[PDB]
Design a protein around this ligand. Sequence first.
Ligand code: FGO
Ligand code: CL
Ligand code: CL
Length: 397
Amino acid sequence: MMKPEDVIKEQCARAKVVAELWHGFTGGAPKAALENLVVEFNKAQQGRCVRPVPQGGYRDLSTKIKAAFAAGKVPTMAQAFENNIALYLEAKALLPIESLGVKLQGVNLTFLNAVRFGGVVYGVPFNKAIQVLYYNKDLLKKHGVPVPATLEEFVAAAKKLSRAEGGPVYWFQPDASTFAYFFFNLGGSYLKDGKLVLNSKEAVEALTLLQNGVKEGWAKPITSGYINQNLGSGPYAFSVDTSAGYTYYLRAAKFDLGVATLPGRTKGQPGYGLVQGTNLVVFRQASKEEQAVAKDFLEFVLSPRAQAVFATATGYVPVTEGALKDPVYQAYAAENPDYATIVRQSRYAKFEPALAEWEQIRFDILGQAIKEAILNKADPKAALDRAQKLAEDLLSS
Ligand SMILES: Nc1nc2c(ncn2[C@@H]2O[C@H](COP(=O)(O)O[C@H]3[C@@H](O)[C@H](n4ccc(=O)[nH]c4=O)O[C@@H]3CO)[C@H]3CC(O)(O)C[C@H]32)c(=O)[nH]1
Ligand SMILES: [Cl-]
Ligand SMILES: [Cl-]
């Protein structure tokens, strides 16, 4: 049956110039909203079009971009994390954005700062997400437990509900993204006078908090799929998870889903969330005509309506001031207090390091330590000491 990618295919077959955009959206609301955005853009051009090409997941995309370098042909544009941008700048692969003529006035300074390398912007914030606290409104009401506003209330609530339901009710992936929440909110930072450190006392404390949660019966490790693909077996109260998960949790949940700001050290402020999602980069190899399509496409992506529509469709955070003044954004915020909660959460935001090696480290070295500690009951300090050695050895090579 006809789909957006068929409309795009036809638009691009008729186009005189096609700028390929390589992305990591495997489906769901993110892929649909990317494709909707592109259809709209392509309609307004006269045979100057973007062609989205799915490369799989984010890791699959960065592997395929690496392979594209080695075959000597890259797309016009791709999604990239900040650390992927640092790696692409080692090959001088990327065009400065402002040079293209993309205006970045009114882009979230948090987002603009993350894509600025030696003071030059190399990425356009596109699909930016923040961690939020997903919760089961039914299950908290069932036991008279308030939505926890502090890490202390969160622990207390997880223990109270786990005892009542006979099962661990805080669900989490044993991964670098989850670790980041507890780490940042315990005072952790990864760079110590510019050196990457995985085994600082806050890192040990954060990984020890999670392991103790599993041993005390209040934290449930999710070993297989996303948290929202595990719902329905046993009691669920809480997860800390990307706002881009919103639509997946909504579809999956057989209970009344809640979205809250993250528990923090005090009721003064929500906790910091990890910023995830990606920026758009433009490859130097692209033709003049392909770069001009990239320019107009990046200008369209940053428009208030494109941002309003994309962010309300997905639970991504609008990247511009102007998006919050767009009536489409405003109507959705009015009907759904979760949009507003997600934006409010976007104000308390921390990033991972932008090192070229950070992808490999976060998955294969830090992610593996966290797994060893959570699933194989490794001593948290021992597991992070090893991670630090392996990280040091990788950087040295
Ligand atoms: N390659 C690479 N990946 C990185 C890096 N830093 C973090 N991440 C990954 O960004 C994902 C967050 O990005 P986000 O755009 O916020 O959310 C994603 C999906 O996570 C989420 N999703 C999809 C299906 C589903 O059933 N549930 C669901 O939540 O929807 C979005 C589009 O797929 C995390 C998840 C991870 O992939 O396990 C590892 C994390 C890096 O440096 N490099
Ligand atoms: Cl899908
Ligand atoms: Cl469910």
